[PDB]
């Protein structure tokens, strides 16, 4: 399980998706989760809610034309949800909250343009992770 602020931040910035222990609120509801029961880990062992749009109604995270925000639960194991969330933008800024969206702390600048240090074969750039291009020997790199 990757469910720490730094673990999920690094996974997001590398892979542009949440790790495999996350399910959206509607998926969780479908799978049996009822918020008022505190039953997420009973119906979905080892899972956490994550991946939904965060509307940023209060404007506490920075806005930009075309930028949207998503959220995921952090440090969840079982019972009712806690107050910790990671926030990630469509341009791959990373913030956190530990007080249920009252305040936020920036924890990563955008990773766009940075190629992760991961060995991967390719024939074209879209075979590579974000930030990476295909080189003349059929491996991805900066």
Swiss-Prot record:
The keyword Repeat does not apply. Its main location: secreted. GO terms for cellular component: extracellular region. Introduced by genetic manipulation and expressed in male sterile maize and rape by Plant Genetic Systems and in radicchio rosso by Bejo Zaden. Barnase expressed in transgenic plants will specifically destroy the tissue(s) where it is expressed. After cell transformation, protein expression and plant regeneration, the active nuclease destroys the pollen producing organs thus rendering the plant sterile. Transmembrane segments: none annotated. Belongs to the ribonuclease N1/T1 family. Hydrolyzes phosphodiester bonds in RNA, poly- and oligoribonucleotides resulting in 3'-nucleoside monophosphates via 2',3'-cyclophosphate intermediates. This is Ribonuclease. It comes from Bacillus amyloliquefaciens. The chain holds residues 50 to 157 of 157 of the full protein.
């Amino acid at each position: 399980v990757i469910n720490t602020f730094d673990g999920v931040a690094d996974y997001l910035q590398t892979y542009h998706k949440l790790p495999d222990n996350y399910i959206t609120k509607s998926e969780a509801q479908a799978l049996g989760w009822v918020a008022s029961k505190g039953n997420l880990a009973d119906v979905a062992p080892g899972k956490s809610i994550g991946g939904d749009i965060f509307s940023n109604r209060e404007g506490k995270l920075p806005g930009k034309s075309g930028r949207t925000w998503r959220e995921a639960d952090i440090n969840y194991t079982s019972g009712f949800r806690n107050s910790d969330r990671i926030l990630y933008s469509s341009d791959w800024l990373i913030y956190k909250t530990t007080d249920a969206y009252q305040t936020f702390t920036k924890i990563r600048s955008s990773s766009m343009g940075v190629c992760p240090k991961i060995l991967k074969k390719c024939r074209r750039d879209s075979d590579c992770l974000a930030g990476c291009v295909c080189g003349p020997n059929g491996f991805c790199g900066s």
